[PDB]
Amino acid sequence: SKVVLITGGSRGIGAASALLAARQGYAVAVNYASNSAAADEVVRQIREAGGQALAVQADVAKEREVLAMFETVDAQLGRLSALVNNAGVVDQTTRVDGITLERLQRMFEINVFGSFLCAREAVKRMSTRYGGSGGSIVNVSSAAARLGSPGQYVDYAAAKGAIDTFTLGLAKEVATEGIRVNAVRPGIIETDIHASGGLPNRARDVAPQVPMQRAGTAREVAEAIVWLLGDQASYTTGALLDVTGGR
Amino acid sequence: LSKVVLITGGSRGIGAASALLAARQGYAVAVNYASNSAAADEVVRQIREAGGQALAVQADVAKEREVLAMFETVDAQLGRLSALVNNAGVVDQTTRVDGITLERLQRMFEINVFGSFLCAREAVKRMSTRYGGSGGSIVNVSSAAARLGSPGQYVDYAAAKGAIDTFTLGLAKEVATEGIRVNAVRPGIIETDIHASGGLPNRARDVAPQVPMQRAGTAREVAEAIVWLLGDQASYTTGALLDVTGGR
Amino acid sequence: SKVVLITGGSRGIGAASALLAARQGYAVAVNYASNSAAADEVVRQIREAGGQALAVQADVAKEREVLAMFETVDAQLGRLSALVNNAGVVDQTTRVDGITLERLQRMFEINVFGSFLCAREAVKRMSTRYGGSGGSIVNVSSAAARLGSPGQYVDYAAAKGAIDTFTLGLAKEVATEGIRVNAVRPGIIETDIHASGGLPNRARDVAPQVPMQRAGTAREVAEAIVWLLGDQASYTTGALLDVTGGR
Amino acid sequence: LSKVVLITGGSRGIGAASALLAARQGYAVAVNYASNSAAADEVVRQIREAGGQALAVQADVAKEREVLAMFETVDAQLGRLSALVNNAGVVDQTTRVDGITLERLQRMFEINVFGSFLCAREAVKRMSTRYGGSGGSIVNVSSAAARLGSPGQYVDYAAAKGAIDTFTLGLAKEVATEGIRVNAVRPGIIETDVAPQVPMQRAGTAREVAEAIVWLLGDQASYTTGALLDVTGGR
Ligand SMILES: NC(=O)c1ccc[n+]([C@@H]2O[C@H](COP(=O)([O-])OP(=O)(O)OC[C@H]3O[C@@H](n4cnc5c(N)ncnc54)[C@H](OP(=O)(O)O)[C@@H]3O)[C@@H](O)[C@H]2O)c1
Ligand SMILES: NC(=O)c1ccc[n+]([C@@H]2O[C@H](COP(=O)([O-])OP(=O)(O)OC[C@H]3O[C@@H](n4cnc5c(N)ncnc54)[C@H](OP(=O)(O)O)[C@@H]3O)[C@@H](O)[C@H]2O)c1
Ligand SMILES: NC(=O)c1ccc[n+]([C@@H]2O[C@H](COP(=O)([O-])OP(=O)(O)OC[C@H]3O[C@@H](n4cnc5c(N)ncnc54)[C@H](OP(=O)(O)O)[C@@H]3O)[C@@H](O)[C@H]2O)c1
Ligand SMILES: NC(=O)c1ccc[n+]([C@@H]2O[C@H](COP(=O)([O-])OP(=O)(O)OC[C@H]3O[C@@H](n4cnc5c(N)ncnc54)[C@H](OP(=O)(O)O)[C@@H]3O)[C@@H](O)[C@H]2O)c1
């Protein structure tokens, strides 16, 4: 049974990915930062449908917690075949001229540094250079990497631009080691994330901006993530897959 | 009966692999070819022997009356299409820009670009919910060359593929309210006959060391990306450019 | 006195580039397709300001006319140092489902083929492989190459996408031969082109969509063209320089 | 009188070349440095000896209080800035991702990314017409790495520069009505020989990058905002 670790697996895109991955036969490590109840609910659904899963707490911005999380996965599920770097946050609407260092630090440490750290630990386990059997990593970026989120969260957009470049660089770096590395760029998706930044109606309000005239679902994003993870995408690496309704 | 897919240049290579895979997924397949009827017939035979439905349809996609007749044949014999794969395409001999003739350019663009526009036109007319269709999906076959430029080899080909990338984005945005998705795959160096057709039969092997994954791709690997994009799992994906390149 | 050939130099961006190039010390060949009066007026203005210039007729889609034009430039001005591939057209507003082959043929033969043909002739003269002293080529692309002109002229956008990739390919191809090749991507510019496609108010109507909230001037595009041509851009080749007000 | 430009990391390399060129164009130049006061003083000496105005200003751009103090110094001694070049930046030793530490990442991003955000914040506050300013221009210094990814060398650096590209675009669009333009230059391999991985077969010079920076800063680039200008020899 291949093992997949999903950071921020407890809600939204991460939860939809967890559920779909399990339907495809992965054992799933569902990471959460504090919402144990949500993570337990994803695990419950997986198990009730006949799959294997484990909820694992860690703040991906904390190196010791990332290490412990991977050790737990090693011990309880086995060596991972797949990693989804989904953990990520927005913040309140801001202009750059209102940005604090503390805001930037948080934005980048979760969205960017967490993805580097989880990828480090994944590569160490996966790479054929270390006797691993290879694997697949999907980073969750955003259309914002291309659009810049002006007047909303240019910092978030920049963090996602870092993720796009990271994706390409890491892909090239491990391409001989049996590892593929890709990113999905979701557009406006129906999740709690918009409410977390003070804009609970954002999916509805911005739908007229999207060429397809609706927000996307978490499940739609999960489909792209799980495709990239799997063997049907065996010559795809360094790809940036837009899931945006045309945005 | 089931959903219908028209695959231009379906007789060989990436097109043929896509035709076989699409049929496995339940599509009825129109396998277009320009001249190699035997190859097309063989793809059709394989599909039918596995219980699928397929028809071989001759057309040079650079010829308007032939594109129209091809769509009319599909309409009559298979039904209203749900999907189009604009795969037909060609390379030409190694050249620098300073050696390019107008005749070469005309050929390169009329097959690789004009053909894809004409076929998309006819597909949209049938698929669009504005015209009483039920929507559909179009996949254009681009290339990594669209990003890289094929210097000293075929900058004209690469430019034709750059046009396809932009056409993909423009058309996707234009028909997004009409139940149609439009996406492109960008293959890298793939094991097909195309390299031999331009005088470089060993190109897949020779260029493999340049690819981060250190091998050429297979037509089946490109077909997988094509068929994924065509299907309902890619339901919020439109205007995407999906690299199938081993990192190149 | 370095010699520059400007395709479609009689009006709009081409004319602005011609006037600016002359101010910088180029002798200018002002190409036109049929508006001899406009070309003669640009030449008159150049000469009045102390520069050298010649009007030269040619439809860039016609190989024989491109050859005759370069031969005239050779004879009357001397061997070119610089080429601006500016000649270009739009057409009426259309959807793809309304596009005819005849429209496509025109769009591409002027916007794409003409650029390749003029580049071919320029390279034959400029390349150090053939005993030339190098040179610089600027192609005029568009923001449409990135945005796609949906519901307006996807065919035009696609032609400009071809130009972007042509720019990169050709730049890489001739990089050791003393030749730089770059592209400017203008946004919405105040010229006659919008009227030629049946939308005379387009610069004004689309301005609210542009982040800077106005259309650009032909002079603003000419500044970028002439910078890329000259020696201050000596390490810049294969670049796509957006002149779009943020669009 | 003279427009004022603040150049972060102005004491050496691209920043120093930009300082010298900007002065030749008539800017008064604030030359920022983190610790190499001697180099910064030398740039200032050259500017002044050629008849320009300049001031060396110490600040670690990753430190908010130091960024604030620096802008306050420029306000007091040179006047309200018209231009900002976010050039301060570092690489680190060659590494794979599987060898990257959090401490490395923290440094890489705080200097290359957070410093650029903080300096742009303070610049926008002074420049924006919405606060009574007269507008201005910001050039960020990115890298070809933003597109290429620096595999097996420094993916972290490449990622930081990718952040700068998106920041550029986002900020440009955010302040476009406020008289502010925001652009980036993406240098390739720049010398401190044949350079075989560059199409042009040589490294670029700091002066070549400075030329592009100063062009973008000036009024000839008046409809250019959100652009990414490659100075890479085709890389
Ligand atoms: N419109 C969209 O939704 C949209 C668009 C573009 C990109 N994205 C990206 O999609 C990804 C998922 O977003 P979503 O909308 O599904 O978000 P969501 O509904 O807010 O779910 C967030 C998930 O991330 C977890 N998380 C947050 N900070 C963490 C940390 N420091 N360490 C570990 N886990 C952490 C949360 O854990 P708890 O449950 O424990 O809180 C939760 O499981 C994110 O990377 C986001 O940037 C979303
Ligand atoms: N490395 C690669 O192979 C590679 C990489 C990037 C992109 N691509 C692109 O992928 C697509 C498929 O290439 P491939 O390598 O599979 O090529 P191929 O093996 O050379 O097959 C070409 C197919 O296109 C058809 N065709 C050629 N001209 C046509 C026309 N005017 N009208 C209708 N059909 C026509 C052929 O019909 P006949 O059978 O009748 O000859 C054949 O079915 C092309 O668009 C190509 O540019 C390929
Ligand atoms: N908003 C914009 O204006 C905008 C935006 C993006 C890109 N562009 C691009 O910028 C370039 C200039 O456009 P514009 O707005 O300056 O155009 P314009 O004002 O319509 O000027 C057209 C110029 O091109 C010439 N021309 C047309 N067809 C030609 C042919 N077949 N051979 C040679 N010359 C020909 C005209 O010659 P005659 O005078 O003899 O007619 C005239 O000199 C084009 O490539 C256009 O696509 C414009
Ligand atoms: N091949 C290339 O050079 C190349 C390629 C791509 C991008 N770039 C980019 O070009 C820019 C300039 O690089 P360079 O090679 O010209 O740099 P350099 O020669 O290494 O000089 C670096 C400058 O940045 C300053 N600096 C470093 N850390 C700082 C901090 N925390 N706060 C404030 N200032 C700081 C230094 O101050 P001190 O003098 O006091 O130490 C110095 O003035 C950078 O953003 C770099 O990433 C260069």
Side-chain angles (χ1 to χ4, degrees), chain A residues 1-47 49-63 65-78 80-91 93-203 205-208 210-247, chain B residues 2-248, chain C residues 1 3-22 24-47 49-203 205-208 210-247, chain D residues 2-23 25-48 50-79 81-191 194-235:
Chain A
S1 197
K2 295 201 174 184
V3 175
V4 60
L5 169 64
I6 304 173
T7 72
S10 55
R11 295 175 298 112
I13 292 159
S17 298
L19 298 173
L20 188 58
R23 279 188 286 273
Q24 300 301 107
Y26 292 90
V28 182
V30 180
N31 155 262
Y32 66 95
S34 68
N35 197 330
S36 173
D40 290 345
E41 172 64 17
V42 176
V43 166
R44 187 192 65 77
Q45 288 181 42
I46 289 167
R47 290 183 186 162
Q52 315 172 50
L54 182 65
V56 60
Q57 186 278 322
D59 181 351
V60 297
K62 289 175 188 159
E63 199 162 38
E65 298 199 0
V66 170
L67 292 172
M69 161 172 67
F70 275 83
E71 290 170 8
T72 293
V73 179
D74 290 346
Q76 305 207 41
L77 288 180
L80 87 176
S81 298
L83 169 66
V84 182
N85 272 322
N86 171 79
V89 294
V90 296
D91 196 335
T93 288
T94 192
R95 289 163 52 88
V96 171
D97 64 11
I99 199 135
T100 60
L101 183 58
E102 174 57 50
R103 169 178 174 127
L104 281 170
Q105 179 66 42
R106 170 179 180 274
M107 185 68 76
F108 276 79
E109 76 193 357
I110 295 168
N111 283 286
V112 183
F113 303 172
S115 287
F116 272 81
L117 293 175
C118 291
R120 173 186 84 183
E121 293 306 316
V123 172
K124 290 176 177 177
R125 290 163 171 75
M126 279 168 186
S127 175
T128 56
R129 219 177 174 254
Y130 311 127
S133 44
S136 198
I137 298 174
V138 174
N139 298 315
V140 183
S141 176
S142 172
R146 290 187 274 102
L147 300 173
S149 309
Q152 292 268 40
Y153 36 56
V154 172
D155 61 331
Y156 170 85
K160 299 308 197 175
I163 291 296
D164 283 5
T165 297
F166 164 66
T167 300
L168 183 52
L170 179 65
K172 291 173 187 185
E173 179 175 286
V174 302
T176 73
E177 294 167 51
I179 302 168
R180 297 179 299 95
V181 185
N182 296 284
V184 171
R185 292 196 294 208
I188 307 305
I189 311 302
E190 296 174 342
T191 73
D192 300 322
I193 204 166
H194 313 296
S196 80
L199 303 175
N201 289 351
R202 182 165 174 76
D205 292 341
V206 191
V210 182
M212 284 186 42
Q213 290 223 107
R214 63 171 180 85
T217 68
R219 166 62 174 276
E220 290 177 307
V221 184
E223 290 286 353
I225 289 170
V226 175
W227 188 83
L228 286 164
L229 282 181
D231 294 337
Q232 297 167 302
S234 60
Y235 203 54
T236 295
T237 194
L240 308 174
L241 178 56
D242 294 288
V243 186
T244 66
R247 172 180 174 83
Chain B
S2 56
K3 296 200 176 185
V4 175
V5 63
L6 169 63
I7 303 175
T8 71
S11 55
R12 295 176 297 113
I14 291 161
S18 297
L20 296 177
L21 189 57
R24 279 189 208 99
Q25 300 301 106
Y27 294 89
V29 184
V31 181
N32 158 258
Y33 67 96
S35 71
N36 198 326
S37 173
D41 289 347
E42 175 63 17
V43 176
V44 166
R45 185 195 65 78
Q46 293 180 39
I47 287 166
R48 291 183 184 160
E49 152 190 295
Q53 322 283 89
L55 182 64
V57 61
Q58 183 280 322
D60 177 354
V61 297
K63 289 174 181 187
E64 205 160 41
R65 56 193 221 124
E66 301 198 4
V67 170
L68 292 172
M70 159 174 67
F71 275 81
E72 290 170 6
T73 293
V74 179
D75 289 345
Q77 304 208 42
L78 289 180
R80 189 165 198 154
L81 86 175
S82 296
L84 171 67
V85 180
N86 273 321
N87 170 79
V90 294
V91 298
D92 195 337
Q93 301 293 308
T94 290
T95 190
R96 289 159 55 82
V97 170
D98 63 14
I100 287 173
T101 59
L102 185 58
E103 152 177 29
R104 167 179 174 129
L105 279 171
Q106 180 60 47
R107 172 180 180 269
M108 183 71 77
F109 277 77
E110 74 193 358
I111 297 168
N112 286 297
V113 181
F114 301 170
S116 284
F117 272 82
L118 295 174
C119 292
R121 174 187 87 187
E122 296 304 313
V124 171
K125 288 175 178 178
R126 291 163 171 79
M127 275 172 183
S128 175
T129 54
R130 288 179 176 195
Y131 310 128
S134 295
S137 199
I138 299 172
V139 176
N140 299 317
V141 187
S142 183
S143 176
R147 291 188 275 103
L148 300 169
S150 311
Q153 180 53 230
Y154 38 49
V155 170
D156 61 333
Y157 173 81
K161 297 308 196 175
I164 292 295
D165 283 0
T166 299
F167 164 61
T168 301
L169 300 179
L171 182 60
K173 293 171 189 186
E174 179 176 291
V175 299
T177 73
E178 295 168 50
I180 300 169
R181 295 183 298 95
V182 189
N183 297 284
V185 172
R186 296 193 293 212
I189 303 309
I190 312 301
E191 294 174 346
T192 72
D193 298 325
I194 201 165
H195 312 294
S197 79
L200 300 176
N202 294 336
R203 182 164 176 82
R205 190 196 56 191
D206 291 355
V207 180
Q210 278 197 280
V211 178
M213 284 184 48
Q214 309 278 261
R215 67 171 178 88
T218 71
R220 167 62 173 276
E221 289 176 305
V222 187
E224 288 285 355
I226 295 169
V227 173
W228 184 81
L229 287 165
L230 281 184
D232 296 339
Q233 300 166 304
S235 54
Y236 203 55
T237 293
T238 196
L241 309 173
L242 178 54
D243 292 287
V244 185
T245 67
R248 171 180 178 88
Chain C
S1 200
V3 174
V4 62
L5 172 61
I6 304 172
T7 73
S10 56
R11 297 176 298 110
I13 292 160
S17 297
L19 293 174
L20 192 58
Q24 299 300 107
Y26 294 91
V28 182
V30 180
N31 154 255
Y32 66 94
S34 67
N35 198 327
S36 175
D40 291 347
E41 174 64 15
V42 175
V43 164
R44 185 195 66 76
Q45 290 181 33
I46 287 166
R47 289 180 184 161
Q52 313 171 49
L54 180 65
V56 61
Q57 185 279 317
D59 180 348
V60 299
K62 289 175 181 185
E63 201 163 37
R64 190 269 272 277
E65 301 197 2
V66 168
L67 294 171
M69 162 174 67
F70 274 80
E71 290 169 9
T72 294
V73 181
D74 290 345
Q76 303 209 39
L77 289 179
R79 206 185 52 204
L80 90 176
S81 296
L83 171 66
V84 182
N85 274 321
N86 170 78
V89 292
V90 298
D91 195 335
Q92 301 298 119
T93 290
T94 191
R95 294 159 52 85
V96 171
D97 67 13
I99 288 173
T100 62
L101 183 58
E102 174 57 48
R103 168 177 173 126
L104 278 171
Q105 178 62 45
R106 171 179 180 272
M107 183 69 76
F108 277 76
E109 75 194 357
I110 294 168
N111 284 289
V112 185
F113 304 171
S115 287
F116 270 80
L117 293 173
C118 293
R120 172 186 87 188
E121 294 305 316
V123 172
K124 290 176 177 178
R125 292 162 172 81
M126 276 171 184
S127 176
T128 56
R129 289 180 185 211
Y130 310 127
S133 299
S136 197
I137 299 174
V138 170
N139 299 317
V140 184
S141 179
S142 174
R146 293 186 274 102
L147 298 172
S149 311
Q152 180 53 237
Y153 35 53
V154 171
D155 60 333
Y156 172 83
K160 298 309 199 174
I163 294 296
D164 282 2
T165 299
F166 165 67
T167 302
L168 182 53
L170 180 59
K172 289 173 189 186
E173 180 176 289
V174 302
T176 71
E177 293 167 50
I179 303 168
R180 298 180 299 96
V181 186
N182 296 281
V184 170
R185 292 194 297 211
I188 303 308
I189 311 301
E190 293 175 347
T191 73
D192 298 324
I193 203 165
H194 312 296
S196 77
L199 303 175
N201 291 343
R202 181 165 174 77
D205 291 341
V206 181
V210 180
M212 285 187 47
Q213 309 278 263
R214 66 172 179 90
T217 70
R219 168 60 174 275
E220 290 177 309
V221 183
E223 289 285 358
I225 294 171
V226 173
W227 186 82
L228 288 165
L229 280 182
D231 294 331
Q232 299 167 304
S234 59
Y235 202 61
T236 293
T237 198
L240 307 175
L241 174 56
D242 291 289
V243 181
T244 64
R247 172 182 177 86
Chain D
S2 293
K3 294 200 175 185
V4 175
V5 60
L6 168 64
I7 304 173
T8 70
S11 55
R12 297 176 297 112
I14 293 158
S18 295
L20 294 176
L21 187 58
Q25 299 302 104
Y27 292 90
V29 182
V31 180
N32 157 262
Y33 67 95
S35 71
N36 199 328
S37 74
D41 292 342
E42 172 63 18
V43 175
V44 167
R45 187 195 64 79
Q46 288 181 36
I47 288 166
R48 290 182 185 161
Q53 313 173 47
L55 181 66
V57 61
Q58 186 280 321
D60 179 353
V61 297
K63 290 175 179 185
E64 203 161 26
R65 59 196 312 265
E66 299 198 3
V67 170
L68 294 171
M70 160 172 67
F71 274 82
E72 289 170 9
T73 294
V74 177
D75 290 344
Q77 305 209 37
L78 288 180
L81 86 173
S82 297
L84 169 68
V85 183
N86 271 321
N87 172 78
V90 294
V91 296
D92 193 338
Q93 71 184 118
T94 284
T95 189
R96 291 162 50 87
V97 174
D98 66 8
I100 289 172
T101 59
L102 186 59
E103 153 171 29
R104 170 178 172 125
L105 278 172
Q106 181 63 43
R107 170 179 179 274
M108 183 71 73
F109 278 75
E110 75 193 355
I111 294 169
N112 283 294
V113 183
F114 301 169
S116 289
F117 271 82
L118 295 174
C119 291
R121 174 186 89 191
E122 294 304 315
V124 170
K125 292 175 177 178
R126 291 161 171 80
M127 276 171 189
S128 174
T129 57
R130 101 172 192 155
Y131 311 122
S134 315
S137 198
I138 297 172
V139 175
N140 299 314
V141 184
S142 186
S143 175
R147 293 188 273 101
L148 302 170
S150 308
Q153 171 178 42
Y154 32 56
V155 173
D156 60 333
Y157 171 81
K161 297 307 197 175
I164 291 296
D165 284 4
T166 300
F167 165 62
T168 300
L169 302 177
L171 181 60
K173 293 172 184 186
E174 180 173 291
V175 301
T177 72
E178 294 165 55
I180 301 169
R181 296 183 297 98
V182 186
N183 296 285
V185 171
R186 293 193 295 211
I189 305 309
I190 311 303
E191 70 174 27
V194 48
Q197 69 268 89
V198 183
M200 284 185 43
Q201 309 279 267
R202 66 169 180 90
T205 71
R207 165 60 175 275
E208 290 176 308
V209 185
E211 288 285 357
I213 292 170
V214 173
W215 187 82
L216 288 164
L217 281 181
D219 296 336
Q220 300 166 300
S222 58
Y223 202 57
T224 297
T225 194
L228 310 169
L229 176 52
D230 292 289
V231 187
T232 67
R235 171 176 167 85

